[PDB]
Each structure stands twice: as C-alpha cells, then as structure tokens.
Amino acid sequence: VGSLNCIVAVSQNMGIGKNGDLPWPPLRNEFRYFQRMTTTSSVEGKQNLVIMGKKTWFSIPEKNRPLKGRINLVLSRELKEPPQGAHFLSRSLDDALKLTEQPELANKVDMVWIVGGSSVYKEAMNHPGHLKLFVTRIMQDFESDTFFPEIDLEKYKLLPEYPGVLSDVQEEKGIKYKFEVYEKND
Numbered sequence: 001v002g003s004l005n006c007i008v009a010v011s012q013n014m015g016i017g018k019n020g021d022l023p024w025p026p027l028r029n030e031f032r033y034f035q036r037m038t039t040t041s042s043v044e045g046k047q048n049l050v051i052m053g054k055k056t057w058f059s060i061p062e063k064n065r066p067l068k069g070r071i072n073l074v075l076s077r078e079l080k081e082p083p084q085g086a087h088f089l090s091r092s093l094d095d096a097l098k099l100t101e102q103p104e105l106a107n108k109v110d111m112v113w114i115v116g117g118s119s120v121y122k123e124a125m126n127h128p129g130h131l132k133l134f135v136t137r138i139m140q141d142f143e144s145d146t147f148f149p150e151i152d153l154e155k156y157k158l159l160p161e162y163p164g165v166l167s168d169v170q171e172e173k174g175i176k177y178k179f180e181v182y183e184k185n186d
C-alpha cells in the first residue's frame with residue numbers, strides 16, 4: 001500500500017526515445033517482459049494502478065488499449081475529462097498519487113507503477129518517501145531527442161540482480177540490453 005514503482009528503459013547514450021518513440025524497434029521480449037512483469041502481482045485479489053503521460057498514451061496503439069490486467073491512468077493538466085480508452089485522469093502527480101493513496105481507492109489499489117514519461121519521473125524523482133526505479137540499459141547506439149536525468153548513486157542503490165527480475169543480458173533483432181534495478185533510501 002502507498003508503494004510507488006518506476007519502470008522505464010534507456011539507451012546506452014542515456015536516451016529514452018525520439019518523437020515519442022523508443023530508440024530501438026519494437027522488442028517482443030521487452031514488450032512481453034514489461035507486461036508480464038507488471039502483471040506479476042505479489043498480492044492476490046488486488047489490481048495494479050499504472051500512470052502514463054499524454055505522449056505515452058497517444059503513443060500506445062488502440063489495439064492494446066485499454067490494457068487489460070491493470071488500470072491505465074493518464075496525466076493531463078489541459079484536458080478536463082479523461083481520454084477515450086483511459087480508466088481515470090489526473091490533473092497532477094500529487095492528485096493521482098493522493099487519490100490512489102486514499103482509503104477510498106486504497107481498497108481497490110495496492111501498488112502503483114510508473115510507465116513514463118520523463119515528466120512523470122521528474123515530479124516523482126522529488127519524492128521523499130521510499131520509491132523503486134527500474135532502469136533498462138540498452139547496449140546499442142541510437143538516436144534520441146530526450147535525455148534521462150542522472151540518478152544519484154548516493155541516494156539510489158544499484159541493484160544488478162534482484163529477485164523477480166532477470167540479470168542476464170537479453171538479445172532481440174540483434175539488440176542487446178540489460179535490466180537494472182534502482183532503490184531509493186528513505
């Protein structure tokens with residue numbers, strides 16, 4: 001309860017994506033791993049609440065939306081009503097987090113998962129409480145427009161091998177990448 005988990009991928013050049021798209025082509029392993037990973041709930045009888053940005057939402061194909069298995073939440077400050085296909089909408093991060101933290105929703109929601117974008121990470125990056133951050137390093141040079149902020153090792157712990165997550169380097173379509181785990185101390 002009241003737990004926040006961050007999960008995002010980044011290129012070896014500290015890249016996240018260009019024009020709202022990942023530097024590397026669609027990865028069947030990265031896509032399945034992400035879904036299967038989030039789908040893997042620790043507590044039975046509960047649902048996971050994920051939050052995505054406007055860019056991320058519009059970037060996700062309708063073929064997958066709404067994403068079954070988990071509740072999709074979009075963060076929009078300009079929009080008044082939630083977008084078609086979305087489960088809920090929040091004006092700000094504090095609003096979405098506060099609502100999910102409230103007993104009213106706490107009964108239905110237990111843990112939260114951040115699925116981008118950088119804007120959401122930036123706001124959450126200033127969280128005082130304990131928070132988890134999953135960074136995937138892609139061993140390959142690719143073009144990117146947005147850069148990811150450097151994580152403080154003094155505050156964040158480098159977890160190369162964590163239970164549930166694979167440590168071995170995967171390879172798809174000639175693209176090698178590794179999953180890294182980061183934990184922030186309170």
Ligand SMILES: NC(=O)C1=CN([C@@H]2O[C@H](COP(=O)(O)OP(=O)(O)OC[C@H]3O[C@@H](n4cnc5c(N)ncnc54)[C@H](OP(=O)(O)O)[C@@H]3O)[C@@H](O)[C@H]2O)C=CC1
Pocket residue numbers: 008009010011015016017018019020021022023052053054055056075076077078079090091092093115116117118119120123146
């Ligand atoms: N390697 C990877 O796994 C992944 C990589 N990426 C890359 O990273 C990029 C991340 O894009 P992103 O940083 O979101 O792009 P932008 O900052 O350009 O847009 C994000 C939008 O999200 C909404 N938003 C974000 N934070 C808040 C907040 N606190 N309150 C209200 N609304 C908020 C806003 O929408 P409104 O305009 O409606 O206010 C904002 O315009 C992707 O485009 C992609 O290139 C993205 C996902 C995964």
Ligand SMILES: COc1cc(Cc2c[nH+]c(N)nc2N)cc(OC)c1OC
Pocket residue numbers: 007008009020021022030034056059060061064114115116136
């Ligand atoms: C869950 O589906 C998608 C999720 C994401 C975001 C995303 C991708 N990969 C990783 N490692 N973290 C993320 N937050 C980007 C996508 O396309 C760019 C998706 O396809 C719909």
